[PDB]
Amino acid sequence: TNTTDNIDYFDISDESNYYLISQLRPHFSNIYFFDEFKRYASYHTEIKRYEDIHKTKVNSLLNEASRAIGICNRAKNTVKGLINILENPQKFKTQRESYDVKLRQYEEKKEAFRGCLLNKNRKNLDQIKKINNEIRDLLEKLKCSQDCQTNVYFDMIKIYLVDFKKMPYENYDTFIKQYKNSYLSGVDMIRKIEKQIDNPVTINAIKFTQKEMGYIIDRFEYHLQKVKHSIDQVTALSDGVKPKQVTKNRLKEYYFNIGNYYSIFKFGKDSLNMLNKALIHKEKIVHNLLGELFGHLEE
Amino acid sequence: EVQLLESGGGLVRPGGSQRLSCAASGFTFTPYAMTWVRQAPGKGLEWLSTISGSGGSTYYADSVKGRFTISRDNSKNMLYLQMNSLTAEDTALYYCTKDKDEYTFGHNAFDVWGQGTMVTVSSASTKGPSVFPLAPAALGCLVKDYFPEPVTVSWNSGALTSGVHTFPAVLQSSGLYSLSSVVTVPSSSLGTQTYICNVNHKPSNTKVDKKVEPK
Amino acid sequence: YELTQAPSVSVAPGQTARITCGGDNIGRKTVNWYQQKPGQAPVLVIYYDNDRPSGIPERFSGSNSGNMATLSISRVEVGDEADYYCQVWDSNNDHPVFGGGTKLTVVGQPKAAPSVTLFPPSSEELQANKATLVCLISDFYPGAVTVAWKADSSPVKAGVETTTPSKQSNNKYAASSYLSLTPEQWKSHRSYSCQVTHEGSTVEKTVAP
Numbered sequence: 001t002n003t004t005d006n007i008d009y010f011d012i013s014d015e016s017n018y019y020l021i022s023q024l025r026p027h028f029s030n031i032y033f034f035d036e037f038k039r040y041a042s043y044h045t046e047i048k049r050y051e052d053i054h055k056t057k058v059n060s061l062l063n064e065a066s067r068a069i070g071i072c073n074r075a076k077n078t079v080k081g082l083i084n085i086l087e088n089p090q091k092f093k094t095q096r097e098s099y100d101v102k103l104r105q106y107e108e109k110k111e112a113f114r115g116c117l118l119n120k121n122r123k124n125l126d127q128i129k130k131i132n133n134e135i136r137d138l139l140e141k142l143k144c145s146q147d148c149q150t151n152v153y154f155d156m157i158k159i160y161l162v163d164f165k166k167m168p169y170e171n172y173d174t175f176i177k178q179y180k181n182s183y184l185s186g187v188d189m190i191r192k193i194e195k196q197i198d199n200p201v202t203i204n205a206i207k208f209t210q211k212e213m214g215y216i217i218d219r220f221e222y223h224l225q226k227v228k229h230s231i232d233q234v235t236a237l238s239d240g241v242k243p244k245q246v247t248k249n250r251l252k253e254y255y256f257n258i259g260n261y262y263s264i265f266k267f268g269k270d271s272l273n274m275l276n277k278a279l280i281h282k283e284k285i286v287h288n289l290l291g292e293l294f295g296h297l298e299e
Numbered sequence: 300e301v302q303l304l305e306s307g308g309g310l311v312r313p314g315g316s317q318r319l320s321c322a323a324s325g326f327t328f329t330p331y332a333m334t335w336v337r338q339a340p341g342k343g344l345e346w347l348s349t350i351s352g353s354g355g356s357t358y359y360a361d362s363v364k365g366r367f368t369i370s371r372d373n374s375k376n377m378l379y380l381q382m383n384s385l386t387a388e389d390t391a392l393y394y395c396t397k398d399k400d401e402y403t404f405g406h407n408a409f410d411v412w413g414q415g416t417m418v419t420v421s422s423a424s425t426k427g428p429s430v431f432p433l434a435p436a437a438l439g440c441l442v443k444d445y446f447p448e449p450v451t452v453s454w455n456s457g458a459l460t461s462g463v464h465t466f467p468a469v470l471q472s473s474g475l476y477s478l479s480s481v482v483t484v485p486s487s488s489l490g491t492q493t494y495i496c497n498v499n500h501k502p503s504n505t506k507v508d509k510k511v512e513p514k
Numbered sequence: 515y516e517l518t519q520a521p522s523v524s525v526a527p528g529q530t531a532r533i534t535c536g537g538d539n540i541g542r543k544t545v546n547w548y549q550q551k552p553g554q555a556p557v558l559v560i561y562y563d564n565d566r567p568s569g570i571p572e573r574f575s576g577s578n579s580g581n582m583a584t585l586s587i588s589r590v591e592v593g594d595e596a597d598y599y600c601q602v603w604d605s606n607n608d609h610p611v612f613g614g615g616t617k618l619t620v621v622g623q624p625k626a627a628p629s630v631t632l633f634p635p636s637s638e639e640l641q642a643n644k645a646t647l648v649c650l651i652s653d654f655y656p657g658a659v660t661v662a663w664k665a666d667s668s669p670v671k672a673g674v675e676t677t678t679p680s681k682q683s684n685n686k687y688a689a690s691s692y693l694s695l696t697p698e699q700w701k702s703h704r705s706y707s708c709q710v711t712h713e714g715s716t717v718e719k720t721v722a723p
Contacts, residue, residue, distance in 0.1 A: 015374060016374060017372075017373060017374040180356075180404070184403075184404065184406045184603075187403070187406070188406060188543065188544060188603070191544050191562045192544060192562070192563070211401070211402065213402075214401065214402020214403065215330070215401075215402055217402065218330070218351055218352045218353045218355065218356075218402055219353060220355070221351060221353060221355025221356050222353035222354065222355040223355075224355060225354070225355040226355075334610070336612075343597075343599065343612060343613070343614050343615040344548075344550075344556070344599055344612040344615070345612065346609060346610045346611060346612060349609065349610070358608065358609050360609070394555065394556070399558070399561065405603070405609060405610050406603045406610075407546075408546040408558050408561035408562070408601065409546070409548070409556070409558060409601070410558045410561075410567060412555040412556050412557070413555065414555055415555060431636040431638050431639045431646075432636050432638065433633040433636065433648060434633075434634075434636065436631075437631040439633070441633075441636070441639075441646060441648055443646060464652065464682070464688070466650060466652075466677070466680075466688055466689075466690045467677060467678075467680045467688075468677075469675050469676070469677040469690065469692060471675050471692075472675075477646075477675075477692060478690075479633075479648045479650060479690060481631065481650060514637070
């Protein structure tokens with residue numbers, strides 16, 4: 001109804017750009033690595049004993065991550081209200097403040113919101129490093145010293161390639177290039193026909209909504225490129241050399257290698273899905289605005 | 300003030316590699332789409348490569364495709380251009396730009412431009428400039444047979460800079476440059492005053508001072 | 515997408531200069547203009563056919579319709595002498611494209627004759643068994659001269675290297691020429707002359723060993 005009911009498409013990363021916080025569970029891509037190590041530990045009797053204490057260590061981080069995101073629901077719904085006013089000309093006319101005033105209110109609340117998602121999760125990011133090191137110590141309890149069989153490592157690679165086939169990368173790449181093409185043409189025609197004689201509310205709402213689209217497109221292509229990397233890297237491992245036995249030190253980083261890739265994949269699959277419907281909902285809002293703009297021709 | 304700063308441009312043998320950098324400051328670097336554009340000496344501007352904000356979209360020109368790679372670090376506001384297998388037709392001065400808006404992917408104007416770094420590709424090695432004095436009214440020094448540009452010429456360690464006028468260097472058929480720097484000074488100052496032209500060449504790592512006086 | 519631009523366009527001061535930029539259907543896409551001073555960086559002058567960045571004088575206007583996009587500079591002063599390009603987004607290739615560039619030259623400035631100084635080969639260079647003659651032309655306008663070296667009274671037609679005219683900060687122009695010759699050629703001849711002809715009137719300097 002020319003309004004946005006879901007603003008899950010915002011995200012924030014730390015100043016080091018190492019951790020990416022998503023509004024969708026599990027919020028962190030590292031949690032997927034923690035859930036995958038439980039599957040890694042399922043094939044090792046020495047590590048499988050500590051799997052019970054691992055869930056309490058991982059679920060607590062997932063609970064505190066889900067708790068910190070919920071604290072920002074006050075900042076979230078505040079921005080959602082300013083978006084619904086700036087993208088809806090009819091709603092913008094029920095209030096009395098100038099359009100430039102509401103844009104300044106939107107920019108202040110938007111960063112206050114994205115700052116909340118990062119600030120309330122700073123304690124969780126430090127816990128990610130600890131659980132990563134705790135996984136390293138659990139993998140040291142393996143019975144192998146210098147001849148660790150890579151069957152478990154390569155059996156997980158075969159599973160990852162099957163999971164990769166479930167995601168439509170070709171359709172996603174076709175979708176993003178096609179919608180990014182329509183988005184660029186929309187911005188460029190507004191440059192051609194813009195004028196400051198009549199009421200610019202319908203034109204201002206288009207550019208405001210288009211600014212949201214360009215952000216969603218940039219975030220969609222980030223995950224689409226990141227997911228492509230994880231698919232191509234794991235596939236390169238299966239098509240590359242297969243050492244029948246490696247040491248334990250290299251086996252720890254072996255699971256860490258495929259674990260990080262599959263984590264980015266499942267994390268990107270969650271984001272690419274949400275970012276796809278947000279771009280679709282944003283296109284319908286713009287076309288309704290375009291329909292409302294070209295609806296009063298005798299004026 | 301939004302500013303773009305570039306470096307890394309230098310002399311490289313054909314087939315070699317070179318890494319260009321574009322330092323950004325004064326604006327939110329992440330949302331804007333950065334662009335690379337080179338300009339051959341005398342020729343016009345030529346677009347090369349533009350990259351999206353998050354880095355998920357990268358464009359390249361057909362002349363640089365397969366050899367050049369664009370990249371950015373959104374935590375340091377840096378912008379890179381890895382050049383590989385450079386040919387003689389790649390020798391140009393390279394600019395980096397940003398779209399005037401955000402989330403545009405190069406479909407915008409380019410409001411902020413860097414000063415440009417110079418990439419030179421040739422088989423010749425760096426040569427030290429030979430400095431010879433120009434005896435007299437109008438006196439100067441001759442900076443001859445150096446490669447590549449530039450050569451900064453200072454008079455008396457920057458003491459006198461009035462009446463000085465360094466001409467743009469000539470490019471001889473050998474590929475070595477040559478220029479001359481003269482200084483306008485009255486005849487009464489001649490004889491008693493001393494004039495030492497100080498020549499500095501960055502690639503050759505050699506500085507030379509020469510005395511000019513009537514003899 | 516091909517952008518055709520005239521290589522050069524001249525104009526007298528106070529008049530209105532018209533830089534053009536052609537396209538098959540250039541009125542369908544926005545056109546941005548740039549200005550690059552000699553040895554300087556490009557500056558966005560006009561964007562989106564007619565929008566003008568803040569700080570750009572009001573004399574800079576733009577038009578775009580059909581097959582022609584034109585940038586207009588009115589009340590032209592000597593400071594407008596620069597190179598102007600147009601930028602368009604390639605539709606089916608998905609990348610920007612720049613035009614060939616139009617060189618705006620302002621005429622009607624007061625004619626000024628070139629001052630030249632000729633230098634003989636230094637004694638330190640003669641010890642290296644090489645000789646170079648330096649002829650330095652400067653402080654002239656318009657920026658176009660013709661240098662001719664003459665051994666005694668006959669042109670040498672060998673070993674002459676001349677630079678392109680460069681615009682100095684004085685809005686004038688400067689150029690230089692070099693003659694490479696053996697010290698035997700320098701000491702055998704009576705003298706060496708540098709003849710630079712500006713607007714049909716020639717200026718010449720003569721030096722001798």
